[PDB]
């Protein structure tokens, strides 16, 4: 109906992303790239060792656990070049289920 | 500039007892309540905030509610390591603003 | 791993200028809000003022505002404090803390400032 | 055209000229001073403090070529909020609200606005303002207020009323919550009238606050002539704020209903301890009365005139009999 | 209406030319918000049966307090009045000296503290 | 990595018929609960159930919807050949949403055997 575009909210300065929900205990990014033949595991904290996933020949199954730290869902979104809204739409866990399709 | 009241300005008690404490707002903070701890020639620790969530790594001990415009710290039994000065900070507004304190004494 | 480090701090004649400095170390100052918090000797804490790098946001204290100016820029990671026209009140230990927004209402939001500095006498 | 406010105490207008090498404002009681600001370049405000005095708002309307549908939409008050697009002006129908403690009561003011030229009209029906952030932003030269056409004055109009939207909203807030403390502690008759009339409150809020939303999407999509291109953001900015009040009361408005359907579960076990009362009471004492009510014949021969002792022996008839109802009681525990 | 919306922007039969299905899909996405909107309604109004039925339990509720407060003030301390009715020559201590204190008092007493006991948890 | 994506939507949606059954359960308990011994808390409990059940619904359309349009709208990041696949996880989701519906409606049910019994009582 109307084009993506960021919400303004009253309390926020304008450019924020806030994480919605309530857990803030756990965060941890879990990696699974796997081929026909060969697959590697390995959990990090680091994001800059799951960034030059994004070229990957072969599947890779990125798992972010922790959304509470916008550092890495912003820096993630940013570099795979996902979309604010979308990023927003993440961070933003009072939603209810829902697709969408970019090119 | 919204004042919070915090109550009692000095207290004792005893270690392995219930101490608790009260911050008034002058006006409606909606929930944007956060609660600090100071011991002496150190920075502040961040112990609960929105007033009843409890941060990570703090102990179970430490809880927080609220009813209307007064929020209420509790400690459910002291221990050694918990005798310093307690802070209320309000959120709700962009000029966010602190109790005047309120210290917890070995008696 | 996370560390804020704030420096910049000393004596002045009073109505004369100041800087203060504050370092981040493990994250990006472009992703959060820096405040300042003072607190005099034989008194309690005092927020001061605050930035959002992402966007220059800035509101500061109405016993400060008018002679403070806080900025921040992301290429050196650091936040910056600017005391104009200091008075015999602003003497005080200054604090750098960094802060996250939570959901309490679609309305209202809060702020808890969850990682702080060391302090630095002015 | 007729006037259906309950407010008719006082009347008073203030108009304030601004621009950008200088500001005028003049309060004044008369309505020919308004009439020479409809040829006016500069942006100017004009309010007119109470809307009973028909004669003036006629007056005003017929001097700034305003259609009657205009005035009896501007005169009447019990409507929803709505916004009309003309080819000459643009009719903003807008609610006030007001909250005390102590006594919960919602307190809407109806509110319009009318925009045309480099003026904006409004209509308050009762003294008592929004408007004053704007107004200080006018008079001491504070933001970009003074640097923009009569669009801007009506963004400015527009969300300081949302911004005591908020407030509003904040007010609830720690309404809801004493009062969730309250039924989850102790419920009784003051405690569900809180509720029922704190949903009702609620409702009109609701009912409010959605017309004001699509007000919103109007002006920012609709892009009238009257309204420049660079404004449209600023309305864009109003319509969100909108949806976070908007979603802010299916959220309150949720609570309370649950609030209310989780006290009115209880009804029939009140209902049986009730009765309960009263069959013992009336199982106790209806055969205590038969007893009590046989000896009192005043028959010329009664057989316990000649039987001696005879109250202890009948009070401890009557006195086991009560025992014996007792002790039929208790099996469930009725008691 | 869901059905045939969501037919028409997929089946994309030749009489609709491509350039007409996002409208379509639009509309789909209209009807699905008003199928939720639906049954939104449905959960309200069975809502609504139910407290029907619990508003009027609670007016019967309150005719019954009112019926149980007058019968328990009333049933025993007529009774207590009833009692001496009987017509008994033997005791002889309503024909002893008295300006009658003491059954209107003991009535007095008995219905004040029938009252505060009704205050606690009041019915009234 | 479409499959993948298949795959761990496949896992949710078993997730989900784990989910209703321990619902199945806990019907089963608070049904023997209100036909046995019908307290004050147990229609605590049925709310609960009931509100729970709603929550349940309306997660669980979009759901569906989104099932359906990865069936149909096929994105070209799906390959074409992992369709079907989507098609059996949308007849799932079908499956799972009119158990939460039966759901719905046997709690209802409870709600007012539970009325039943406390009219008996106070009719004894
Ligand atoms: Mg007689």
């Excluded at chain 2, 009813?67 to 221990?79: E, K, N, W």
């Excluded at chain 4, 009896?72 to 019990?78: G, Q």
């Excluded at chain 4, 919960?104 to 003294?127: A, D, G, P, R, Y």
């Excluded at chain 4, 309305?235 to 976070?244: L, P």
Aim: glycine letters at 6%; proline letters at 4%.
């Amino acid at each position: 109906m109307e084009e993506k575009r960021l919400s303004a909210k009253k309390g926020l300065p304008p450019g924020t992303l806030v994480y919605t929900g309530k857990y803030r205990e756990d965060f941890e990014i879990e990696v699974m790239n796997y081929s026909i033949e060969e697959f590697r595991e390995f959990k990090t904290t680091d994001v800059e060792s799951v960034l030059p996933f994004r070229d990957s020949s072969t599947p890779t199954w990125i798992n972010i656990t922790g959304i509470h730290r916008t550092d890495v869902v912003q820096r993630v979104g940013e570099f795979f070049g996902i979309h604010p809204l979308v990023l927003e739409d993440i961070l933003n866990v009072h939603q209810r289920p829902k697709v969408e399709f970019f090119e | 500039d919204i004042q919070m009241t915090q109550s009692p300005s000095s207290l004792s008690a005893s270690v392995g007892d219930r101490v608790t404490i009260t911050c008034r707002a002058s006006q409606s903070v909606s929930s944007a309540v956060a609660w600090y701890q100071q011991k002496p020639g150190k920075a502040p620790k961040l112990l609960i905030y929105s007033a009843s969530s409890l941060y990570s790594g703090v102990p179970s001990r430490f809880s927080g509610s609220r009813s209307g415009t007064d929020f209420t710290l509790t400690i459910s039994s002291l221990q050694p390591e918990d005798f310093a000065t307690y802070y209320c900070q309000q959120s709700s507004s962009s000029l966010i603003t602190f109790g005047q304190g309120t210290k917890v004494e070995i008696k | 791993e996370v560390q804020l480090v704030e420096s910049g701090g000393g004596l002045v004649q009073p109505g004369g200028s100041l800087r203060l400095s504050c370092a981040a170390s493990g994250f990006n100052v472009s992703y959060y809000s820096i405040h300042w918090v003072r607190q005099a000797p034989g008194k309690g804490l005092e927020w001061v003022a605050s930035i959002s790098s992402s966007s220059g946001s800035t509101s500061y204290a109405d016993s400060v505002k008018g002679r403070f100016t806080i900025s921040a820029d992301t290429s050196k990671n650091t936040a910056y404090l600017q005391m104009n026209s200091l008075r015999a009140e602003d003497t005080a230990v200054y604090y750098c803390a960094r802060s996250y927004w939570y959901y309490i209402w679609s309305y209202s939001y809060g702020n808890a400032m969850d990682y702080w500095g060391q302090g630095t006498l002015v | 055209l007729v006037y259906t406010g309950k407010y008719r105490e006082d009347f008073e207008i203030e108009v304030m000229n601004y621009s950008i090498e200088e500001f005028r404002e003049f309060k004044t009681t008369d309505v020919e001073s308004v009439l020479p600001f409809r040829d006016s370049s500069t942006p100017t405000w004009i309010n007119i403090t109470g809307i009973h005095r028909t004669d003036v708002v006629q007056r005003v309307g017929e001097f700034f070529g305003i259609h009657p549908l205009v005035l009896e939409d501007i005169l009447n008050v019990h409507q929803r909020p709505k916004v009309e697009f003309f080819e000459n002006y643009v009719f903003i129908v807008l609610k006030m609200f007001t909250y005390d403690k102590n006594l919960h009561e919602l307190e809407s003011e109806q509110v319009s606005l009318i925009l045309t030229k480099n003026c904006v009209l409004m209509f308050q029906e009762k003294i008592g303002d929004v408007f004053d952030p704007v107004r200080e932003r006018i008079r001491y030269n504070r933001g970009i207020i003074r640097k923009k056409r009569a669009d801007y004055l009506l963004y400015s109009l527009i969300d300081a009323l949302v911004d005591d939207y908020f407030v509003l909203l904040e007010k609830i807030d720690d309404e809801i919550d004493v009062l969730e403390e309250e039924v989850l502690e102790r419920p009784e008759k003051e405690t569900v009238q809180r509720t029922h009339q704190l949903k009702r409150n609620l409702v009109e809020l609701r009912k409010t606050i959605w017309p004001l939303r699509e007000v919103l999407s109007s002006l920012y999509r609709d892009v009238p002539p009257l309204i420049e291109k660079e404004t449209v953001p600023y309305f864009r900015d109003v319509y969100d704020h909108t949806i976070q009040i908007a979603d802010t009361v299916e959220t309150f408005r949720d609570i309370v209903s649950g609030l209310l359907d989780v006290y009115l579960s209880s009804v029939s076990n009140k209902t049986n301890e009730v009765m309960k009362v009263l069959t013992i009471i009336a199982t106790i004492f209806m055969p205590l009365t038969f007893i009590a009510g046989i000896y009192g014949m005043n028959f010329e021969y009664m057989p316990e005139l000649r039987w001696k002792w005879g109250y202890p022996v009948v009070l401890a008839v009557m006195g086991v009999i009560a025992v014996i109802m007792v002790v039929y009681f208790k099996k469930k525990k009725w008691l």
